[PDB]
């Protein structure tokens with residue numbers, strides 16, 4: 049019968065704390081606080097939030113797209129996932145001074161930083177084979193050979209690449225950690241949109257830990273979410289007020305449906321979310 | 335539920351590691367207890383978080399920061415000030431066990447001094463003339479605070495993968511982010527690895543002071559220092575000393591005074607700073623790993 053304190057309670061309490069204690073400014077207008085941390089257990093559960101329906105197909109296709117090393121919004125949009133599309137549009141690139149760049153070209157965003165770190169970005173169709181540091185593979189290789197290493201870090205915040213990117217990274221850095229055959233990951237997110245992005249961000253890095261745990265032969269342990277600037281847009285306060293009234297249902301489980309040897313070999317069909325019973329969708333105006 | 339404040343957050347982390355920390359070995363052989371992921375918020379508002387449950391080497395904190403600020407990677411330059419904490423990490427015998435034999439005694443690699451004033455430059459040696467090369471992240475932080483304080487990208491890096499091959503001891507501190515609201519400056523430090531007994535009380539005072547410095551140059555008031563840890567470990571040989579420390583009751587934090595209006599970060603001198611109403615318990619000797 050009795051269940052552990054649901055992990056969603058940490059998110060909802062970060063909401064209620066920003067609503068109660070945050071200070072107001074602009075950017076549509078925000079309530080904001082600086083410095084938060086929550087710990088989401090990954091052991092026999094998957095922290096896909098239940099107090100609204102989170103866009104799981106979005107989370108999954110987006111990560112498969114990072115791992116592929118794509119920086120082309122259209123490669124994701126073609127999977128039915130539109131979330132990067134406004135950032136690669138003609139006007140949006142133009143208004144950043146990227147007028148010679150083709151539609152969709154996001155510059156050196158996550159997929160590039162993860163697979164080609166430090167290489168010279170040209171364009172999104174370019175071939176980067178064996179340029180840059182493949183941080184993701186190095187991470188996997190170190191977990192498999194020295195799991196006690198205290199420098200297992202993948203870096204997305206690259207100061208040289210900021211002026212080339214269609215969006216500055218929300219996510220600065222990941223650190224991985226292994227104890228007793230369990231893999232944890234802590235994400236430093238320098239800026240979080242709490243209503244609209246964070247529930248998605250939480251599912252993303254939890255899924256990346258599951259995938260890494262899978263290919264390194266380990267068990268998923270915790271996902272530690274650390275925020276810098278944590279903000280709620282004002283147009284989200286009322287919907288969040290309603291979200292807070294709802295009771296979390298038990299987290300679902302994530303099944304991986306076959307043995308996968310390499311990280312580039314995961315496909316969308318290898319994943320099954322099971323027993324996901326969310327409260328109804330909440331639309332937050334982006 | 336009311337969170338622990340002040341020094342008590344530090345004693346509680348120690349206590350959680352002693353109890354819940356699992357046994358591991360590190361790259362020095364010494365044995366550690368470790369946990370992963372921790373966070374504390376140290377107010378800087380009309381107090382300064384120099385630990386009182388043991389005496390912290392304040393002149394060491396101050397002098398080390400002044401050394402980072404001037405761009406230095408040479409342990410010898412801090413040593414000559416009477417502060418020996420980086421000595422061991424630049425010794426022939428420590429350097430030798432990292433294929434770093436062409437590097438002169440005391441050349442620490444592209445550590446914090448290089449990273450803050452010359453980021454993304456090409457390191458060589460500790461004597462080399464780096465004027466005009468790399469990004470001066472520290473000056474950038476300051477100027478951004480004066481011009482666009484609401485900016486949520488005020489981040490200073492010490493962790494550069496491209497430079498990892500060139501380093502003896504790779505940064506314990508990966509990044510700082512800075513944050514301004516209602517004319518208050520906060521700083522959050524992401525510490526990928528924290529030696530809880532020896533270094534972390536030094537790290538706390540250190541980044542506190544940096545925040546106080548950048549506040550003063552910008553005419554802002556100090557907000558909070560948020561300390562976030564990745565791997566947080568206690569050396570086995572630190573347990574007995576820490577057990578002694580944990581039975582002592584904390585006394586109020588002291589106050590930090592800046593004794594004159596300084597213009598630029600580089601112009602701060604040791605004598606500009608006064609610590610007032612520091613009443614710590616006795617020193618507790620702990621062995622450096």
Ligand SMILES: Nc1nc2c(c(=O)[nH]1)N(C=O)[C@@H](CNc1ccc(C(=O)N[C@@H](CCC(=O)O)C(=O)O)cc1)CN2
Nearest residue numbers: 390391419420423506529532533534536618620622623
């Ligand atoms: N083991 C270890 N090595 C490290 C660090 C660390 O925290 N731990 N550091 C992390 O950045 C750097 C140096 N930091 C240090 C800070 C303080 C002391 C120390 O022994 N403090 C004494 C001061 C006594 C005195 O000299 O008067 C003490 O407080 O007991 C050592 C290293 C580089 N290497």
Ligand SMILES: [Cl-]
Nearest residue numbers: 170173174175
């Ligand atoms: Cl090409």
Ligand SMILES: [Cl-]
Nearest residue numbers: 551552553597
């Ligand atoms: Cl002035």
